[PDB]
């Protein structure tokens, strides 16, 4: 197990209850790369625990052959005398993002590595986070806002496919795999959701009548 035997032994010796910290989880499909990373970088310096998710689908402005070259100019730079100590080059889009964030953080101070260590990125949406709460979005980082639709753009996961990120197919098969499992379960619930949605209008009838005039005032009726 990842936890030590003692903090399993401690948690069982003090009992109480399982714990999870308050965590944000940001979807990332069609969020501009460098705008979404800034917003995230400033929330990591404020003490927030952020799970980035679907990094493959982040966008960049401009043609794909162009942003390929930008990353290839980044491969050209390595330490010539001993590259194992030369600047490292990460491929996988979740890693491209934690770098675009990281270089925007004071990463050489214990609060710069304390902020970064609170971010967690992913490809797709891993089961570790599929169902916990509702995914959030960064409306000033969105593509349908930030980019004129006339301009060509890139999908970070397609750019990073033609550098050494070979997991692209493995991810596309896990996204096709979940989005069914979710929408099968979603439509399954349509029997229940309509029950409640009916039970509010059906309750508004036999609910005491001086309250419903309040709901009509302040508008929930």
């Amino acid at each position: 197990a990842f936890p030590s035997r003692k903090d399993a032994s401690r948690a069982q010796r003090k009992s109480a209850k399982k714990h999870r910290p308050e965590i944000i989880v940001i979807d990332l499909k069609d969020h501009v790369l460098g705008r979404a990373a800034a917003v995230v970088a400033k929330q990591l310096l404020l003490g927030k625990k952020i799970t980035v998710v679907r990094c493959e689908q982040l966008n960049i402005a401009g043609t794909e052959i162009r942003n390929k070259i930008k990353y290839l100019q980044y491969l050209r730079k390595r330490k010539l005398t001993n590259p194992t100590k030369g600047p490292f080059h990460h491929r996988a889009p979740s890693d491209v993002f934690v770098r675009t964030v990281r270089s925007m953080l004071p990463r050489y101070t214990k609060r710069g590595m304390k902020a970064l260590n609170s971010l967690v990125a992913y490809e797709g949406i891993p089961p570790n986070v599929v169902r916990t709460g509702g995914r959030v979005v960064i409306p000033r980082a969105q593509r349908h806002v930030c980019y004129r639709s006339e301009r060509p753009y890139t999908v970070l996961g397609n750019m990073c496919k033609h550098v050494g990120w070979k997991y692209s197919d493995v991810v596309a098969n896990l996204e096709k795999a979940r989005v069914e499992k979710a929408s099968r379960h979603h439509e399954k619930q349509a029997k229940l959701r309509d029950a409640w949605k009916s039970a509010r209008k059906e309750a508004l009838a036999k609910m005491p009548k001086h309250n419903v005039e309040v709901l009509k005032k302040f508008g929930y009726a």
Binding site: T81, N82, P83, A92, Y122, G124, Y167, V170
Partner: protein, 399 residues
């Protein structure tokens, strides 16, 4: 300022570090692509190196000066007793790497295998696998074996088999090791449920080489080269030893760098190791897959020689001894010294060509002694050239 005359650099920067290998075992770093039409099969096998001989065969290659002619080709003999299959393991496929799912252990393991887990076995309490052999049965233990198979069927991409050597059935007292060398063997072909069907039928059963390989196929070998300990730059890399007059010695490299970078680059040749580095050769073509002496003697006889013989030379393979079990005979050198374990794996490189598709028919196999110059093929050929002899004239007086 530029170097006066260009010459190709010494050594291959892709085999760096020159580094003494983590294992003597020579495991395969990959396995060939899945065809997923061909029936499932095991893709590699553990093999012990015995020695080398040459052979005589006649080439069929239209277009060559050697066209229909006899050619003497050196050949390495590698004995390969049956491997036993102790386990099944399978691999979920994640956006980072493969990951094992579980492993299903056979219901019986020899002491050869659990000989691994201790480092002093005979003075151990010898409790390895004591508890599962107990829990692999009853009820809660029939279920858990069943749900990890069902885990493979649903969630697994690759499925492998844990197979170890038999060092009893190979009786060689120069190898010395009573621990059973263990590796995983990947099962290629068929759907994922068809692999579990095969692998579940292999457990506890032996695997002969001929089931894995075919005579004239090529197989590429994963093995660990002969360690020389620290060697100078001239043996380690090519470095064109310096002239006689030089002060402080001539086997050095002279200029290991410019002023700037003020550093020594990783590409400049230094001294060390020249080690037992791990290597995977390609396209080592199998000439003969033999059979054990006990079963089918006349190993080195042919449709041509017709003299009852075996592959073990007169006086044994030097430093190795007689090859008791079935063996592969394989054209060319294999890295590593005698006695070392190696794995033959189904060839990865695409095989379409005249050289690499051919039917090998051997005319002759050289059993002459490798000590000295052996001029005799068999012990009978020797007793004909001498005959009665002073120590022989004596032993008949014991009668």
């Amino acid at each position: 300022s530029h170097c006066k005359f260009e010459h190709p650099r010494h050594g291959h920067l892709g085999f760096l570090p020159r580094k003494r290998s983590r294992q003597i075992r020579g495991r395969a770093r990959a396995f060939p692509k899945d065809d997923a039409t061909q029936k499932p099969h095991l893709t590699s096998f553990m093999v012990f190196k015995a020695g080398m001989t040459h052979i005589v065969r006649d080439v069929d290659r239209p277009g060559s000066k050697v066209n229909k002619k006899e050619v003497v080709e050196p050949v390495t003999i590698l004995e390969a007793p049956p491997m036993v299959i102790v386990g099944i393991v399978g691999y979920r496929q994640t956006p980072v790497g493969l990951k094992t799912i579980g492993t299903v252990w056979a219901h019986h393991t020899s002491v050869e295998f659990r000989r691994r887990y201790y480092k002093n076995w005979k003075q151990s309490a010898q409790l390895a696998f004591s508890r599962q052999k107990q829990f692999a049965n009853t009820k809660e233990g029939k279920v858990a074996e069943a749900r990890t198979l069902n885990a493979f069927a649903k969630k697994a991409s690759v499925i492998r088999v844990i197979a170890h050597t038999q060092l009893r059935k190979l009786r060689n007292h120069r190898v010395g090791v009573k621990k059973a060398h263990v590796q995983e063997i990947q099962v290629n072909g068929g759907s994922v449920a068809a692999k579990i069907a095969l692998a579940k039928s292999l457990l506890e059963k032996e695997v002969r080489v001929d089931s894995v390989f075919q005579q004239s196929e090529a197989c590429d070998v994963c093995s660990v080269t002969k360690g020389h300990g620290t060697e100078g730059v001239v043996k380690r890399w090519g470095v064109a030893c310096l002239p006689r007059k030089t002060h402080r010695g001539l086997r050095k490299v002279a200029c290991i760098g410019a002023w700037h970078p003020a550093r020594v680059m990783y590409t400049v040749a230094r001294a060390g190791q020249h080690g037992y580095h791990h290597r995977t050769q390609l396209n080592k073509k199998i000439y003969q897959i033999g059979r054990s002496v006990a079963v089918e003697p006349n190993q080195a006889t042919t449709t041509y020689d017709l003299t009852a013989k075996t592959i073990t030379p007169m006086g044994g393979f030097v430093g190795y001894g007689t090859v008791r079990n079935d063996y592969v005979m394989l054209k060319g050198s294999v890295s590593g010294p005698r006695r070392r374990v190696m794995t033959l794996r189904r060839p990865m490189a695409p095989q379409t060509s005249r050289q690499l598709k051919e039917k090998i028919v051997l005319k002759f196999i050289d059993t002459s002694s490798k000590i000295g110059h052996g001029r005799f093929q068999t012990k009978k050929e020797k007793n004909q050239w001498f005959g009665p002899l002073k120590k022989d004239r004596i032993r008949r007086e014991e009668r």
